[PDB]
Design a protein around this ligand. Structure first.
Ligand SMILES: Nc1ncnc2c1ncn2[C@@H]1O[C@H](CSCC[C@H](N)C(=O)O)[C@@H](O)[C@H]1O
Length: 191
């Protein structure tokens, strides 16, 4: 029950409760979450997106360490691309996951990513997790966000975009500085 494993379980759990079968992982990195989704037949489509070629090659590498039925491999798709660009391949998914990605975006990229995600793609579900820098300080990697910053960011999202947000920490209550990992589950409003 490591921290990362806690994050993944938390994300998979949120996807399932929303019955999000078709998922796109933005900033997929080495494919940690992609490996878990591909192995799980609950998911009907797994797509991972990253701007790094090195990371995508590695993702494909470990994803290949899996043994799966033939029809199961056709669910996977790897795409190189920046998250700040409106890619038509980002449409039609039940959910988009942005895991430990926001902290590594500067101002001239965060705003663009927000539109790409909450306006352009506009999936029904969006799961975002980021490190709680208030936990990393009390229990020692410092450009992370505070619980306040993260929650204001997310609330500001529901003010500009057609979404409502629910917070669900995945780590373990301090219970003074909250859990080590903050998660936000955005659900699109009905029309
Ligand atoms: N503008 C951008 N467009 C696409 N990917 C980006 C990006 N900026 C950063 N990334 C990617 O976002 C990832 C941040 S670390 C990702 C870890 C991964 N989510 C996990 O399974 O833990 C890296 O792969 C980085 O290359």
């Amino acid at each position: 029950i490591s921290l990362n494993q806690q994050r993944m379980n938390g994300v998979v759990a949120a996807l399932k409760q929303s019955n999000a079968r078709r998922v796109i992982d933005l900033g997929c990195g080495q494919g940690n979450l992609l490996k878990i989704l591909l192995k799980d037949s609950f998911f009907e489509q797994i797509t991972g997106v990253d701007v790094s070629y090195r990371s995508l090659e590695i993702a494909q590498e470990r994803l290949d360490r899996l043994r799966l039925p033939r029809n199961q491999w056709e669910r996977l798709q790897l795409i190189q691309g920046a998250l700040t660009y409106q890619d038509k391949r980002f449409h039609g998914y039940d959910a988009a996951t942005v895991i430990e990605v926001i902290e590594h975006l500067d101002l001239s990229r965060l705003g663009a990513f927000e539109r790409v995600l909450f306006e352009f793609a506009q999936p029904k579900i969006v799961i975002v997790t980021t490190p709680n820098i208030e936990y990393n300080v009390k229990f020692a990697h410092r450009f992370e966000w505070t619980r306040s910053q993260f929650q204001n960011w997310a609330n500001k999202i529901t003010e500009r975009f057609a979404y409502n947000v629910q917070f669900q920490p995945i780590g373990e209550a301090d219970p003074e500085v909250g859990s080590p990992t903050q998660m936000a589950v955005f659900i699109h409003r009905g029309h």
